[PDB]
Write a structure and sequence with these properties.
CATH architecture: Roll
Helix content: 10-25%
CATH class: Mainly Beta
Strand content: 25-35%
Strand order of the largest sheet: 1-6-4-5
Radius of gyration: 13 Å
Shape: globular
CATH topology: Pdz3 Domain
């Protein structure tokens, strides 16, 4: 099984997105593929907030289930978010032991 733990991180939108890029497992064309922060950019609310780092998988965003949406769908929901809007992104951290 996969070890690790889930975490909840809410970031306050600040125009310059959140400073986090997400990758797609690419399980299927359009069915259900797990998305996880490919890397935390040095310009956003995430890095400034210091709560959500890289190597995490988005389990839910703003109370939404990203278990079937898509990469563009996921990125779309975050991209839709505007300034003055705390986006609660539930991530999943995994250890290497």
């Amino acid at each position: 099984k996969r070890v690790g733990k889930r975490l909840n991180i809410q970031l306050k939108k600040g125009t310059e997105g959140l400073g986090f890029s997400i990758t797609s497992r690419d399980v299927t064309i359009g069915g259900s593929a797990p998305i996880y922060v490919k890397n935390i950019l040095p310009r956003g609310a995430a890095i400034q907030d210091g709560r959500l780092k890289a190597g995490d998988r988005l389990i839910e965003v703003n109370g939404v289930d990203l278990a079937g949406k898509s990469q563009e769908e996921v990125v779309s929901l975050l991209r839709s978010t505007k300034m003055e809007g705390t986006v609660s992104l539930l991530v999943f951290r995994q250890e290497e032991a």
